[PDB]
Amino acid sequence: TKEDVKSFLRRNALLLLTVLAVILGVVLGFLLRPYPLSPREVKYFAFPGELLMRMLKMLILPLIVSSLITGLASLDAKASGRLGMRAVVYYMSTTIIAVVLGIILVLIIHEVLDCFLDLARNIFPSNLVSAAFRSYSTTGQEVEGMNILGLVVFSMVFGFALGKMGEQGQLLVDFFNSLNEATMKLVAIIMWYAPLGILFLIAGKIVEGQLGMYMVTVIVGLVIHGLIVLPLIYFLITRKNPFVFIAGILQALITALGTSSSSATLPITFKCLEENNGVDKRITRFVLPVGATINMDGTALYEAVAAIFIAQVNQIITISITATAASIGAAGIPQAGLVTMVIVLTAVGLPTDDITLIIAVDWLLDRFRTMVNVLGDALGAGIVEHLSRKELEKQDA
Amino acid sequence: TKEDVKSFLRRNALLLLTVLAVILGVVLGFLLRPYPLSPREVKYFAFPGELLMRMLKMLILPLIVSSLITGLASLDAKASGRLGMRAVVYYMSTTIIAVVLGIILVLIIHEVLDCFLDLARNIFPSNLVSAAFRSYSTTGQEVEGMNILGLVVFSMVFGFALGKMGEQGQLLVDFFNSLNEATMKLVAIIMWYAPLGILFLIAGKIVEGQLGMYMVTVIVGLVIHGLIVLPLIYFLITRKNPFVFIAGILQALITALGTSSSSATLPITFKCLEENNGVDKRITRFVLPVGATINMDGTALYEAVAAIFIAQVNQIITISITATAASIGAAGIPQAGLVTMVIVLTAVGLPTDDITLIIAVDWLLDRFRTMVNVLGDALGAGIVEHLSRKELEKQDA
Amino acid sequence: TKEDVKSFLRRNALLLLTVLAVILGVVLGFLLRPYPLSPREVKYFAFPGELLMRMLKMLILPLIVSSLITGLASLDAKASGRLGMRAVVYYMSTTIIAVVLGIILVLIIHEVLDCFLDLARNIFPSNLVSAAFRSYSTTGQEVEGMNILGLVVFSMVFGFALGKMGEQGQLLVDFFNSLNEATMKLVAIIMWYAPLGILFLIAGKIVEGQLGMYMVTVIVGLVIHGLIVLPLIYFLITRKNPFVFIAGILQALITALGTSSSSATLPITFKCLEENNGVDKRITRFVLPVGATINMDGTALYEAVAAIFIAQVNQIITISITATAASIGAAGIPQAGLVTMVIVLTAVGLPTDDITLIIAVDWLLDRFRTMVNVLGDALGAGIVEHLSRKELEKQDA
Ligand SMILES: COc1ccc([C@@H]2C(C#N)=C(N)OC3=C2C(=O)C[C@@H](c2cccc4ccccc24)C3)cc1
Ligand SMILES: COc1ccc([C@@H]2C(C#N)=C(N)OC3=C2C(=O)C[C@@H](c2cccc4ccccc24)C3)cc1
Numbered sequence A, B, C: 001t002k003e004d005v006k007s008f009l010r011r012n013a014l015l016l017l018t019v020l021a022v023i024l025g026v027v028l029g030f031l032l033r034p035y036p037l038s039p040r041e042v043k044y045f046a047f048p049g050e051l052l053m054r055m056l057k058m059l060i061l062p063l064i065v066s067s068l069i070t071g072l073a074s075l076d077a078k079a080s081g082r083l084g085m086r087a088v089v090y091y092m093s094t095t096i097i098a099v100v101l102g103i104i105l106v107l108i109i110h111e112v113l114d115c116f117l118d119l120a121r122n123i124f125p126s127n128l129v130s131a132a133f134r135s136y137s138t139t140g141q142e143v144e145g146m147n148i149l150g151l152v153v154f155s156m157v158f159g160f161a162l163g164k165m166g167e168q169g170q171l172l173v174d175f176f177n178s179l180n181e182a183t184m185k186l187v188a189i190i191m192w193y194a195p196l197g198i199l200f201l202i203a204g205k206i207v208e209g210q211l212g213m214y215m216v217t218v219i220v221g222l223v224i225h226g227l228i229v230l231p232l233i234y235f236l237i238t239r240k241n242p243f244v245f246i247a248g249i250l251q252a253l254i255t256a257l258g259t260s261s262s263s264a265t266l267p268i269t270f271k272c273l274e275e276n277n278g279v280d281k282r283i284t285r286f287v288l289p290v291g292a293t294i295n296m297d298g299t300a301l302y303e304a305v306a307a308i309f310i311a312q313v314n315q316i317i318t319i320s321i322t323a324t325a326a327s328i329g330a331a332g333i334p335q336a337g338l339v340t341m342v343i344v345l346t347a348v349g350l351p352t353d354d355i356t357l358i359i360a361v362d363w364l365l366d367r368f369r370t371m372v373n374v375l376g377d378a379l380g381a382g383i384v385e386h387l388s389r390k391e392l393e394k395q396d397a
């Protein structure tokens, strides 16, 4: 039992390094906490964690495009719809269970139109080159930050258009498969930088009562949905140990607990499922890019608790529907999850000005929130893969 | 005669739908006209027509690039110059007849240097990625809106550079031919959205004497050049019925009567000539992208009438040359045709401040103006195709 | 001797034309010098030289990307490191000899932290499409002008990732080799415009004591390092006549003496080495893109003289290290070499406000400064090619 320890210290050496970086990140951060938290000084200390995010976000653009293009071309007309329906039924339910449990824990223990239009404006981009670095935000009208929604949508219909012309449109698919493979080699390179980054990402961010109880409500709620409810969903589908599957994607969850972005961690998550858990590439390039942008189970729970927590200052159907709708939401400027807090409160009738209270604790919750967002699509991949046994068998020979 | 009606209701079902959308567009627009024409309210009603333009303009960038690249590579050194000379002699004459007839109807019934330099600055782009979403406008110096001129020029010399290296540069040509085909599948998809868009595009834009007579001068002038002069040019070249050819490209003219942009309609025009009229792809990818940006017969007529109409408030050679030069013009910010009205009046000596009069009626004229711009290159394609009998025969085997 | 003159007037006809353009450029410039040097008037006269720079800079982006991608894929794991180590040992020494000689001639005859971070932020781009037209400059935070550093770095690791997957990643390499060849055909086209441009580039820029002696210090210093020291380095490696090699790349040096940018001239330099001097493409696509951005021997000499020249108004180790570090420097906004003058003086302790003195003469020195920057990598190519005899032999069959 205590003899086979060295065989684990050599195998998962980097997995121990990113864990030790989480340990040392708490160490160095609290060590430099008594010193002044000057804006420049903080941003200079949080620079090796900043460099990591630049390498990580540069890799997502040629990843999501090449993923969905080959992902839909390598699937039949009915096979693409089937795999999709299996994923959507999973996405909607996992964002509906997290909101239900999220509403229970808080009730037991404790322009809006222009947003709909901008999302629709972003689903159909006016320019593709622009979409690769610009999103639409009304009131000039194009804000900085890649329009992932417009790219995901275009990549799907373009990829499916290739999968409908076959022989002619094989060249482009063979181009996008080599490009997806090249960025999957680049992710193995940037993988080694992760410990040095995850350290300064959480070391630099810790140098920044009534909220005390709220913090535990969400944290425990996320543990019940993520480490209790979600593994039971996997066992109800595959009948395989999920706590061994989750172990394989640890390097992606540990980084999610640092980066706080399912986007920044999607290339590592892609490697953790294609290499460690050995999931079929045909479904990773399909489920993972969509899942990271739409399936946000960690967000659904946090949006529900925050809406009822501010009600203490002062019709659950108007809150449960909006919090599930906020999870699919990715409009305007890219943020930490506070970008959609105005929309979730206006539709019900709660005070919008009560947001400044939760922002002080939000940053530590964001790290746990992202872990569930990644765990949602990660476990979801196995569930969709197991449910698409016929579709994946027919593709070979 | 009245028995073969159902065989037309099933065949050209979408062509009847876009016509009925033009009918219902007049219906719903005038129905909601008594109500307040509030800025937000109008822009929200004109949203399903707005979404259409986003899908349409996203498709032009990978269309014009792939069109001209394969279009010049699939043609010999002399064959490219020949086909080109046939198109230029046609372009210059169709913009010279429309100005002559345009000058007759109005005379019978009724910095400028920095603009030349910006056009030249835009012919040779400083950066290609920039050119895909930015144009040059002096006084920071790069305005939003794709530099079509710089793309058309580069696409030609890049495509011809591939057509000069052959075997080596075949791979890229085979890539750009699959990409042109993929966006031609995407246009068939967006084709079905057109009725729902063309409805709200003209329904939302109708909720917005001396000019009364001017409006008819241009409208009748356009009918004489477009539906009388232009079909006679086609009959003088092909000796085939043009009123059957124009019927094939109806779905592109009906949309031009809505979108008001030969750019937005170029992907539909590409489908209407490659699928309905059965024109050779080798000349569509050649003539159509250039024709939509340079051959503007509807503009030449409107620029001539507007210049002499403002003279009523108060040397035809100084007006006839500038109005033909305004048609080739595509500099600065993309507009509705009023962007070049300062240039056409300064060179002759007419009052520039008299522009605010015609802008109120310009929007309805723009819809008819574009129809002639599309009809110019559409009929032009057949004429060039028929004139390049030897060049297209030698290319096979 | 005087009989074989016509055989040179027909062969190097364009090389005589660009030389005659340098002659006529001095002629027309001084002819129009008595007239008013109005801002607009100057910019309109310097327009045919302006058009040249637009064609030249549009060609660098698809050149450097395709160059380094095929350049590292067509080399073995150790072969890439070897060729690289040979180039780096050459780069660092040529920037160390130019600073040493630069420090001798001037001493015989006569936030800074935010700059380090921005360079590191630019080495790892956050977005690739952005990197193709945007650089990082702190205090919104992304300035206009292609991030060459981030492109050079990415192009290397992406190209090497293809060279590690072989057969799979051969398609993309065969794509990038056809694209590098296409822009090498486009450079032969733009080559003919060079005389008409180089004329108005130096004709328009000449219409714009204590500094008199400083001007000669640098000019003579550059001649000693470039036309005396550098050819001796080539003879110490190849044992071949360098004054015949330099003659082949004349059309690239003559243009450098006009454009004043090693970027703008890199496509011509690429043609002058691949066509005239007959250097192996395998090392041109390797050494040249890097060399133009990092190896700046003309800058190292000018940075050293300017730092000690301003000391006349008032520890050489603090000046010699910074001037060598300024040569590798390419951060923020693209300039004429004055962008790094604040950094080189703050680290030592010299007055930063004394910059406004040398800017009046800097423009004529810049033209000679660039010639050494181009001559550095041009001669460097031959030296690396000769030093990589084994690596280039093993690549064939
Ligand atoms: C809110 O945004 C999304 C985007 C994608 C999806 C689904 C998904 C996932 N996960 C992936 N990878 O592919 C497809 C999906 C479909 O349901 C539709 C499916 C599909 C089937 C058949 C034809 C198609 C043509 C174009 C695009 C998708 C198509 C592909 C769901 C919601
Ligand atoms: C104002 O802007 C334009 C742009 C294009 C054109 C003509 C055209 C049309 N329509 C198309 N499709 O191709 C060519 C044209 C030529 O006349 C030139 C022709 C050509 C022949 C031979 C070599 C070439 C090399 C580079 C570019 C074009 C070349 C191609 C005319 C005016």
Ligand SMILES: COc1ccc([C@@H]2C(C#N)=C(N)OC3=C2C(=O)C[C@@H](c2cccc4ccccc24)C3)cc1
Pocket: C072, C077, C080, C081, C084, C085, C087, C088, C152, C156, C157, C160, C285, C286, C287, C288, C290, C291, C294
């Ligand atoms: C300041 O910026 C630079 C960038 C490049 C270089 C060198 C160079 C030149 N000149 C070129 N063409 O390629 C390589 C170089 C290496 O030293 C490293 C070399 C290399 C070898 C092995 C594996 C690599 C993997 C990724 C990138 C480069 C790699 C390639 C030096 C400094």
Ligand SMILES: N[C@H](C(=O)O)[C@H](OCc1cccc(NC(=O)c2ccc(C(F)(F)F)cc2)c1)C(=O)O
Pocket: A060, A064, A148, A260, A261, A262, A263, A264, A266, A289, A290, A292, A293, A296, A298, A299, A329, A330, A331, A335, A336, A337, A338, A366, A369, A370, A373
């Ligand atoms: N931390 C969460 C959280 O990034 O998944 C989430 O972050 C805020 C947020 C809100 C709405 C949309 C997003 N979108 C992304 O970060 C994103 C996710 C994935 C991609 C993709 F490219 F597909 F990989 C691109 C972008 C993020 C939250 O805190 O609620």
Ligand SMILES: N[C@H](C(=O)O)[C@H](OCc1cccc(NC(=O)c2ccc(C(F)(F)F)cc2)c1)C(=O)O
Pocket: B060, B064, B148, B260, B261, B262, B263, B264, B266, B289, B290, B292, B293, B296, B298, B299, B329, B330, B331, B335, B336, B337, B338, B366, B369, B370, B373
């Ligand atoms: N409605 C006309 C009218 O778009 O063709 C015309 O619109 C204004 C105008 C003026 C100058 C240039 C343009 N250019 C375009 O709209 C355009 C046309 C074609 C393309 C292309 F990409 F090649 F398809 C790109 C842009 C438009 C007019 O009203 O005179």
Ligand SMILES: N[C@H](C(=O)O)[C@H](OCc1cccc(NC(=O)c2ccc(C(F)(F)F)cc2)c1)C(=O)O
Pocket: C060, C064, C148, C260, C261, C262, C263, C264, C266, C289, C290, C292, C293, C296, C298, C299, C329, C330, C331, C335, C336, C337, C338, C366, C369, C370, C373
């Ligand atoms: N004239 C010099 C001088 O352009 O090489 C130099 O110009 C200023 C300067 C300073 C720092 C960086 C640069 N970089 C470039 O011009 C540049 C060089 C090469 C490329 C590349 F793309 F690789 F070809 C891109 C950009 C220029 C100087 O005067 O010191």
